[PDB]
Amino acid sequence: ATFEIVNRCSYTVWAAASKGDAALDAGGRQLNSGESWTINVEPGTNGGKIWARTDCYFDDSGSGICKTGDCGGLLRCKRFGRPPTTLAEFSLNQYGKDYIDISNIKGFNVPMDFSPTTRGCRGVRCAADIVGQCPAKLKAPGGGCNDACTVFQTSEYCCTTGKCGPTEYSRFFKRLCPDAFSYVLDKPTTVTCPGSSNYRVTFCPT
């Protein structure tokens, strides 16, 4: 499946793509403002994620640091990124269908649209100014808006036993972005697409 990753932000981002125990395609790349990078994701990839990283520095070996979404200091991510990270999430070719969503469960750094480029389903978007509106206790000094689990490490925010409810913090994310997961047991906003759809992830779509 192809994913065209487009940076419409006025700032550089370092795109990342991983399924948590491996890179997807090269795993990451710099995208200056306006640039597009197309990756190929294998059929059957379960639990894939794409995200933006901000404020990165990499040496000539692809080792370094990012202020949001750092994946073990690698340009080419094999692992998931350090919160806060807005997440484009997907599982493809699942009993013949693909499933896509956006999640704020690991916080928010960059606005994004995640849409099919092929027929048969809608896209999802989280493009409100979550960083600007972020509650004081969730603001990340390194940049972005943390989720409450990251900040407070409670069973209720982290949904550790699978019984949690919505919270004042999750409701903030849900108010700003109704179309994204705000906590682990949120009413799902997952879209079912035809198996083997192709996609575009756009940072700063508005």
CATH number at residue 186: 2.60.110.10
Bond before 84 cis per omega within 30 degrees: yes
Domain enclosing residue 140, as ranges: 1-206
The answer to whether the beta carbons of residues 102 and 189 sit under 8 Å apart is yes
Q: What are phi and psi of 160, to 5 degrees?
A: -55, -40
Count how many domains the chain has: 1
Query: What is the rounded distance in angstroms from the CA atom of residue 43 to the CA atom of residue 24?
Result: 11
Query: What is the rounded distance in angstroms from the CA atom of residue 71 to the CA atom of residue 48?
Result: 14
Chain centroid offset of residue 196 CA: 20
The answer to whether the beta carbons of residues 73 and 58 sit under 8 Å apart is no
Residue found under tokens 């493809």? 92
Query: What is the rounded distance in angstroms from the CA atom of residue 200 to the CA atom of residue 157?
Result: 31
Resolution to one decimal, Å? 1.0
